[PDB]
Structures are given as structure tokens and as C-alpha cells.
Design a protein around this ligand. Sequence first.
Ligand SMILES: Cc1cc2nc3c(=O)[nH]c(=O)nc-3n(C[C@H](O)[C@H](O)[C@H](O)COP(=O)(O)OP(=O)(O)OC[C@H]3O[C@@H](n4cnc5c(N)ncnc54)[C@H](O)[C@@H]3O)c2cc1C
Ligand SMILES: Cc1cc2nc3c(=O)[nH]c(=O)nc-3n(C[C@H](O)[C@H](O)[C@H](O)COP(=O)(O)OP(=O)(O)OC[C@H]3O[C@@H](n4cnc5c(N)ncnc54)[C@H](O)[C@@H]3O)c2cc1C
Ligand SMILES: COc1ccc2[nH]cc(CCNC(C)=O)c2c1
Ligand SMILES: COc1ccc2[nH]cc(CCNC(C)=O)c2c1
Ligand SMILES: [Zn+2]
Ligand SMILES: [Zn+2]
Lengths: 230, 230
Amino acid sequence: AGKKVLIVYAHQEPKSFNGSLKNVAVDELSRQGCTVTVSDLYAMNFEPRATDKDITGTLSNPEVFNYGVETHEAYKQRSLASDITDEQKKVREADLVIFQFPLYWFSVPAILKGWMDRVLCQGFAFDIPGFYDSGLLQGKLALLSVTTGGTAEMYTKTGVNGDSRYFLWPLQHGTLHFCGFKVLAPQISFAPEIASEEERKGMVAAWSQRLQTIWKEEPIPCTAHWHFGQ
Amino acid sequence: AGKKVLIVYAHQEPKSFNGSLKNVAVDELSRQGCTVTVSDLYAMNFEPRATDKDITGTLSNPEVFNYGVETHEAYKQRSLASDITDEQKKVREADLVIFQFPLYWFSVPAILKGWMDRVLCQGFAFDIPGFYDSGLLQGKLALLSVTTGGTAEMYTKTGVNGDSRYFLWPLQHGTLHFCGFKVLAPQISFAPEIASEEERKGMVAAWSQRLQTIWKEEPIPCTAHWHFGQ
Ligand SMILES: Cc1cc2nc3c(=O)[nH]c(=O)nc-3n(C[C@H](O)[C@H](O)[C@H](O)COP(=O)(O)OP(=O)(O)OC[C@H]3O[C@@H](n4cnc5c(N)ncnc54)[C@H](O)[C@@H]3O)c2cc1C
Ligand SMILES: Cc1cc2nc3c(=O)[nH]c(=O)nc-3n(C[C@H](O)[C@H](O)[C@H](O)COP(=O)(O)OP(=O)(O)OC[C@H]3O[C@@H](n4cnc5c(N)ncnc54)[C@H](O)[C@@H]3O)c2cc1C
Ligand SMILES: COc1ccc2[nH]cc(CCNC(C)=O)c2c1
Ligand SMILES: COc1ccc2[nH]cc(CCNC(C)=O)c2c1
Ligand SMILES: [Zn+2]
Ligand SMILES: [Zn+2]
């Protein structure tokens, strides 16, 4: 209600189920009085590739290009490409970052993987040392709102695809927790293409419903046990 | 007769450790008499975004764009973009596909995620019921040759990053095994940037040596147990 939210959205079609989930999030968070910003990656033609065009100043080592080293320096020097710094400003100001996307190969679509690769650079999102619980984005919350082609049953320990929490590991732990985020439970909307119109409406309303009390939620314990068990 | 190998390579710098690993694989497999092809993604400025430009001609439903449906239809109608079909031909002809890349956020760099998203389309790499053990690329071998920033110790069951098999899941099981590939054990070159010059030349040498008997190797048992179990 007195918070800022950044929604990083990755779907090509406004009329899609992902489009609906993104829109209801904007509607509900706005109704609450929150400040809301959406980075619609495909509409922005967001650059996913990590290249030397991401640094505009003199390279530290112009003979052997190392993306991590050069972007870390460029961040400190303020010589990163502006599309990257534009996103960093949104993240810096946000209290909560919601990622809205369809699962592609049990991960994020490449345009969103590119956002992770390029925006969460050393110096901004983490440092060495300064990761996991000491990540630079500590104090901020993050939530993955994903949609799948597979059904919930397929995403179980005994299902063909295994438990859904397994594929969340690189994203929730390896990325968000690594950067210091407290991770809220994922919103997983299963197989909307298969579901009925009513079921679809039900999944949208369940997300809107959850958002009504999102600020009262506790984050998940982002650990190997939560993700894998035993 | 002999064997064909496709190396999908994702690094910006020819002089990099990844570059050396790619070059030694070409050298050794070429020496053995194998047919070798390399898709140098950054040099090709490979497009990572899944968009409507991936279909030439007219869409099956230009009212509501569904990437999966549209690319499935385009594959069947021979209407996919040429960058995608060029890669599919290389995959179709290959007996082994080696992916050479540095680990970015517990996964592949976005440009390689884009190759995965755009090249491995329904109808080409999988279908109903062609998936996992019956995936359409059955008969082919696949192998991940990854370099990391974190030490082998950090990637232990109780290490801060967790076991490496944890992040391998979405790639080995969710992607490669899903498409029918028999997955060979991953080649992990841990923290080459911190290692000594000789430890480095050592890691390169180990990879070249392993490649000497790559065709005698047996595919790992790609299962939830292999990745998380004991
Ligand atoms: C490259 C690629 C890789 C993939 N890999 C995976 C994977 O690893 N695992 C997996 O499980 N899936 C995978 N998928 C499938 C993908 O995750 C699903 O297609 C996606 O999650 C469905 O989301 P959508 O928004 O596109 O659905 P839509 O096609 O939009 O379908 C949802 C339906 O809901 C309707 N709808 C929209 N808004 C509303 C509303 N407000 N109320 C009611 N109905 C509404 C739509 O019109 C539509 O008919 C992959 C897809 C691609 C293209
Ligand atoms: C966006 C991003 C996200 C990342 N996320 C992760 C992550 O999730 N997990 C993680 O662990 N790390 C992560 N990293 C780190 C990354 O995985 C490592 O930086 C990368 O794997 C190192 O490989 P390289 O080829 O770039 O090394 P290089 O720096 O190119 O090479 C290391 C050294 O080897 C030397 N060398 C090259 N060839 C040879 C040879 N033939 N013999 C001897 N010496 C040689 C080089 O000159 C150099 O000094 C991330 C990096 C970035 C930029
Ligand atoms: C990995 O498992 C799945 C499961 C359900 C799915 N539905 C659709 C796709 C992929 C469709 N991509 C293209 C480019 O055509 C898919 C993959
Ligand atoms: C997990 O996320 C990341 C992201 C960008 C990165 N750059 C470099 C490293 C690892 C290098 N650290 C040590 C001391 O082993 C890294 C990790
Ligand atoms: Zn965690
Ligand atoms: Zn498997």
C-alpha cells in the first residue's frame, strides 16, 4: 500500500494467460495504492545477449574480453549500456519484484534469462564477498509467477517432470537468493492451455486473491531441503 | 561409417578458457576422423528471442500469437526462419551434440538458452508421445561442457551452491533427456579463472583425453535420483 513493485514480464502476447496474470497484478497492486512498474521485455525488444556492447568505456583488458570483469568495472565507473542501468534503477527502487513468465525448458524464456544475466551484475546485485544472505539486494522481496504446459500431476516427485520445486532451484536459490532477495512462494498456474475457461478464470482470480495479502506473507526458507526434501 | 559432432559454443572471447576447450574438442574430434561442425553463437549474433519473426509467411492464428503452436505448425509447413532451420539440420545430422559454455546463473547464457528455446521446437525435438525416452532426437548423444566461477567445494551437497547435479536438472533432464538425447556425463571445469596456469592446461588436457574415448562411454541414468538422490 506504501510499497513499490516491479513486474518483469516475458510474454509475446497481450491477450495470453500470462498477459492476464500480469494485468490483474497491476490492477490489484494499483488498487491497493502501491507504485507499480512493468518491464514488458518483448515489447521493449530487450537485448538478451551478454556482449561487449554492454560497456561503453575503456575496457580493463581490451585483449581478452571477460564479461563479468568488464561489467563489474563498468558498473563502478558508470559506463554500462543505458538499457541495463534503466532496469537497475527499477530494481533498486522496488520493494518487491515479480517475474511473470511461461516456463521454457523448465526455466525462464531466453529474453528474461538475458535480463538476469545483464541486469544483475557484480557491484549492483552481489559482490565477492556479498552474496546469498549478504547479497546486495537484501531487504527486497522476489516472487516467480510461472505458467506451465505440463499439469500439476506431471510436476510431482512421481510425475514425469519431477517435482516443480526442482526446476525452481537455479532461479530461486542460484539467482534471487544469491542476490540477497527474500523469496516469496512461487505462484504456479498449471497448464492453462489444457484447463477450461472456468478453471482459467479461477487461476487468475486466485492470483489476484493472493495479491490482496501479499505484504503479510513470510518468505520461503530458500534451502536445499525446501527444494529437494529429506 | 564415421560420426558427426555438433559443438554449440557460447562464449564471446576466442582466447577464453571456453574457447580453448572448444578448440581442443575440434582438434581431437577432427584428428579421430569425425565430421565436426561448430555453431559459435556470439559470432553468429544468434537471435535468442522467441518471436513471431521465427515464422515466415502467414500465422495459423494472427489474432492471438502462441509461440509453441505457431512454431509447431511452421515446422510441419517448412515455414520456420532460416537461422532455426540451419541449426536443426546440424542437429539432425549430428551423432553427438556438445554444449560448451560458462555457467551463468546456474544455467546457460541467454544466447544459448535462446538456441534451446528456438531450435528445439515441437515436431522437431519432441511431440506427443515423443519425449524423454522416446524423444524425437533419440539415438543421439548430448553432453554439457561447463565452466564455473564457483569452486568444486562450493558445489557440494552441503556447500553454499549445492550439488552441481541440482542445477544440471533443467538442462540434462528437462531439456536434453526430454528431447530423446542419451546424456553423457557433464564435463565440469571448476573455477578456471582462479586456478594456476598449469592447473588450467591440465583441465584442457583432461577434456582432450576424455574425448579420445567419448564413443565408448555409456549415457548417465538421467533420473531424479541421479540428480538429487543418493
Ligand atoms: C520454447 C518453449 C519451451 C517450453 N518448455 C516448457 C517446459 O519446460 N515445461 C512446461 O511444462 N511447459 C513448457 N512450455 C509450455 C509453456 O510453458 C506454456 O505454453 C505456457 O506456460 C502457457 O502460457 P500462455 O500464457 O502462453 O497460455 P495461453 O496459450 O494464453 O493459454 C491460456 C488460455 O487462457 C485464455 N485466457 C487468457 N487470459 C484469460 C483470462 N483472463 N481468463 C480466462 N482465460 C484466459 C487464453 O485465451 C488461452 O486460451 C514451453 C513452451 C515453449 C514455446
Ligand atoms: C552473467 C554471469 C553470471 C554468472 N553466474 C554464475 C553461476 O551461476 N555460477 C558460477 O559458479 N559462476 C557464474 N559465473 C561465472 C562464470 O561461470 C565463469 O566466469 C566462467 O565459467 C569462466 O570461464 P571463462 O572461459 O570465461 O574463463 P577465462 O577467464 O576466459 O579463463 C580463465 C583463465 O584461463 C586462461 N586460459 C584460457 N585458455 C587456456 C588454456 N588453453 N590453458 C591454460 N590457460 C588458459 C585465461 O587466459 C584466463 O586467465 C557467471 C558469470 C556471468 C558473467
Ligand atoms: C519440456 O516440456 C514441454 C512441455 C510442454 C510443452 N508445450 C510446448 C512445448 C515447447 C514448444 N516449443 C516450440 C518452440 O515449439 C513444451 C515443452
Ligand atoms: C552465482 O552467481 C554468480 C554471478 C556472477 C559471478 N561472477 C563470478 C562468480 C563466481 C566467482 N566467485 C568465487 C570466489 O568463486 C559469479 C557467481
Ligand atoms: Zn536459497
Ligand atoms: Zn532424465
